[PDB]
What does this fold into?
Amino acid sequence: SQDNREIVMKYISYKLSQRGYEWDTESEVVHQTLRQAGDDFSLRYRRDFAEMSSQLHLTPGTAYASFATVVEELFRDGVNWGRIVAFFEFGGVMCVESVNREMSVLVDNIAAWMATYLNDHLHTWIQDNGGWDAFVELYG
Ligand SMILES: C[N+](C)(CC[C@H](CSc1ccccc1)Nc1ccc(S(=O)(=O)NC(=O)c2ccc(N3CCN(Cc4ccccc4-c4ccc(Cl)cc4)CC3)cc2)cc1[N+](=O)[O-])CC(=O)O
It folds into this structure.
């Protein structure tokens, strides 16, 4: 019912489309509110966005460790919607950088990592905080 997998796929498709790359359930109201919040996050936290984009040194064998290290740091002091939006933007940076560095094979892997983290680690918090509808109530 949270449909976190399709939320991830639609989000990553949008991020890759913004950079000119074509790649591969909840209301459009949720999908559009999330992508607008993520665009706004990265224009508000531009230095952070740019630093993350620059300092990722992706290879296939180390990309998961990069993902897991950053996500643990992001949620170390707990979960809030803003950090969830930052998590989506981070996955979008990892996907775009993968395509830029001729490692496009990583995009489907990163999408799986994101869906899995939502389902296994953020699911309880999302349900307890009123689901994706509550995200829209606050930030739509
Ligand atoms: C106009 N619009 C769209 C405004 C939407 C509004 C502002 S946009 C925004 C702002 C902050 C977070 C997300 C979106 N949204 C918002 C505002 C506050 C909040 S909130 O819950 O009070 N949280 C915060 O304000 C917040 C602010 C900053 C946050 N980060 C967390 C990430 N951190 C860098 C970082 C640290 C550790 C690990 C990774 C990173 C990192 C992660 C990703 C990248 Cl690309 C780069 C670095 C930088 C600071 C995290 C949360 C949440 C949202 N939201 O979820 O959409 C509708 C409206 O009017 O409400």
